[PDB]
Amino acid sequence: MWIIEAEGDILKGKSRILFPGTYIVGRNVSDDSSHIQVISKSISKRHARFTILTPSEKDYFTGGPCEFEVKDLDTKFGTKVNEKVVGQNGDSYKEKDLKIQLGKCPFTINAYWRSMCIQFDNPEMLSQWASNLNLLGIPTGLRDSDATTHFVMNRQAGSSITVGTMYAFLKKTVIIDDSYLQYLSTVKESVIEDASLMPDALECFKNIIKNNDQFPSSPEDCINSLEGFSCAMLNTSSESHHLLELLGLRISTFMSLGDIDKELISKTDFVVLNNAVYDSEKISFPEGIFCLTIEQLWKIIIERNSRELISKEIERLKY
């Protein structure tokens, strides 16, 4: 998101978030969702046009900013951006840092890009929110990205948190839900006038951990809590692989379940199964080895006992 700020009284001492759209900047306009007042003497009645475009396809993956367009409105004294004269048919900027000077006025309008990219847990929630967030200048997606700052979990009364959510939690990502997204959309226009009115994602996130029995005390407790243990794992999602590695697990990945040699048993402490293979193939899985789902493993992880809990369960199924 583009934030603008000024080092005089010229923006009233308020930061503004500039969502995708078009803003008339000058001294005779008021404060709309589409008008910005700037008091100074050397600036025209209607001085500048700021136009913020919606995110590019790459912005989710690069973290780069929405295009910021600056048009001078046939001004006597002109407009400058980064000390270079804007004129002609305007200019468009892709840098994260913009110094905008209007006329001979020494107090400058400073645009800066604050990172916010939102990953979703599934296609269903994405479809529900994509276009909306696109209009708020927030890149969205399903794939992993080094630019992601926030992850949206599916909130559901019945079941476990998903693997996606377990992983985002352990990766140290801020987790948010549907209701934060509702909040952000109702206060859109108010936040343009005052950046500090921006809904706080950390409050939503801290509230989720507190109100939920499906989250450990801290991501830091879990990381490397199972180092020293090794497990075998039938195929599974790539989220599942990386999740287990963060827990400090040595991972062997078999395919058939009939790929279980004496080799594996002798060097594997327990085994992680898909939901499907766990329920029906209780007739054909190995006799000595402890078997659990990712869902159950996570429930072990939440406990204070984790290692003592798995240890004594290997000793139960070995005698």
Swiss-Prot record:
Keywords, alphabetical: Chromosome, DNA damage, DNA repair, Nucleus, Phosphoprotein, Telomere
Lineage: superkingdom: Eukaryota
Main subcellular location: nucleus
GO CC, one annotated term: chromosome, telomeric repeat region
Lineage of source species: Eukaryota, Fungi, Dikarya, Ascomycota, Taphrinomycotina
This protein's name: DNA repair and telomere maintenance protein nbs1
Annotated GO MF terms: chromatin-protein adaptor activity; damaged DNA binding; molecular adaptor activity; phosphorylation-dependent protein binding
Entry annotated with the keyword Ribonucleoprotein: no
Impact after mutating residue 103 to D: Strongly decreased ability to recognize and bind phosphorylated proteins
Domain BRCT, residue spans: 107-186, 228-302
Organism name: Schizosaccharomyces pombe (strain 972 / ATCC 24843)
Annotated localization: Nucleus; Chromosome; Chromosome, Telomere
Its job: Component of the MRN complex, which plays a central role in double-strand break (DSB) repair, DNA recombination, maintenance of telomere integrity and meiosis. The MRN complex is involved in the repair of DNA double-strand breaks (DSBs) via homologous recombination (HR), an error-free mechanism which primarily occurs during S and G2 phases. The complex (1) mediates the end resection of damaged DNA, which generates proper single-stranded DNA, a key initial steps in HR, and is (2) required for the recruitment of other repair factors and efficient activation of tel1/atm upon DNA damage.
GO biological process: DNA double-strand break processing; DNA repair; double-strand break repair; double-strand break repair via homologous recombination; double-strand break repair via nonhomologous end joining; mitotic G2 DNA damage checkpoint signaling; mitotic intra-S DNA damage checkpoint signaling; telomere maintenance
Start and end residues of each FHA domain: 23-86
Assembly mode: Component of the MRN complex composed of two heterodimers rad32 and rad50 associated with a single nbs1. Interacts with (phosphorylated) ctp1/CtIP. Interacts (via FxF/Y motif) with tel1/atm.
UniProt note: domains: The FHA and BRCT domains specifically recognize and bind phosphorylated proteins.
Similarity field: Belongs to the Nibrin family.
